[PDB]
Amino acid sequence: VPMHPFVKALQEHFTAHQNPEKAEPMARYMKNHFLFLGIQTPERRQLLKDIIQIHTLPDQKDFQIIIRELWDLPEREFQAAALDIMQKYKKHINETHIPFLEELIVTKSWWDSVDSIVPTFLGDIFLKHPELISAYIPKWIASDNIWLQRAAILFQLKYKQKMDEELLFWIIGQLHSSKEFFIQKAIGWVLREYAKTNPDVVWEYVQNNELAPLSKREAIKHIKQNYGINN
Template sequence: MKKTWHHQDIIEKFEANRNEELAGPMAAYMKGHFPFLGIKSPLRKQLLKEHFTEYTSPEPEQLFEEVWKLYNLPEREYQYAAIALIEKMKKHLTLGDFPVLLEFIETKSWWDSVDSIAPHFVGQLVKMDREYGEKIMLEWSQSDNMWTDRSAILHQLKFKQQTDTELLFMIIKQHADSKEFFIQKAIGWALREYAKTNSDIVTNFVEGNSLKPLSKREALKHFV
């Protein structure tokens, strides 16, 4: 029988595997934005797999309360664990969860957390109701927060044939002149990923619009 969920058990597992020698280089890789425990990705995923096997999941109505208990801890591995918990229970996400996902995006923001939350969880919600999701994404795309803008650009990253190209191109054009590195990269990444499904429409879009060199280079790098 599985044990009852408690976030403290994850903390104990992670603390038992703290590695100060690895923590410094890992923090440096993230430009010093976050402290690290020094648990590399393969071990972290193994520890979480063991935990999810050994313990029950939280009740759906307690999901985000439990996620925040991990996400608010200082070390970056706890944000990864929090995101893994959402992934484990993503079938319980609803359209009402856009605001809390936005809060995660705008809290302890960096590319690693945003690029997990936007394509996987935000994209899932948009697919539930495309009309409502488009409205929310257009609101996000006009945010003063760069990471929220990036999320709007990337939310269809895994949609393939289900991509709403009109929405994708509309949001990209809103940010085509951005000087932000992470916005330029997101534009290129979103276009490059969709090019795997429809290279012609991406090529035509890139050729017909004024994009920053980085965005254009990223968009076309694998098929030109």
């Protein structure tokens, strides 16, 4: 069975605007885990828009099919476009899509794709269905996959006043001993971001619980100005 024609059209149009000179630094920035065509986001978005204008967005029955097919293409721009396309189907994504989203997190994994899946798509699902958190988060923390561990940390990133503080700190406690940069940094990020809503709670947590040095420093990068740096 051939590639979906929308994907074939997108592949043709992206490839015709590839930039091998830019592709080399773009691939190096992702530590050469991926081939790149060399197309940056403003142009990539317009090229996708060109294809939607010509072909129309596929019927929602094909949404997951399109995403998978783009995920399986070698160049990283096709995963970025896949995430752009998934946003166009946002109103059709619900709690039944958590396994589909998990599979995207653990395939072609790196911070660029995972961070575009977790605080937005999964974050919105678990805000609406917080009773489903315990069906996934414990497994993610226990898994060998650092990107599911990062998902457990960052899905609440944007929750602000809806943050479940007890849950957040329990998750961080489970992962505070990790030597993985992407876990230590995710802990620092979510704490730094939540400190924009509740600085006192974050300050108390980082002063009284063990964290990797990187995590602590990133957490208080801004709020240390409010409290001071004791001699």
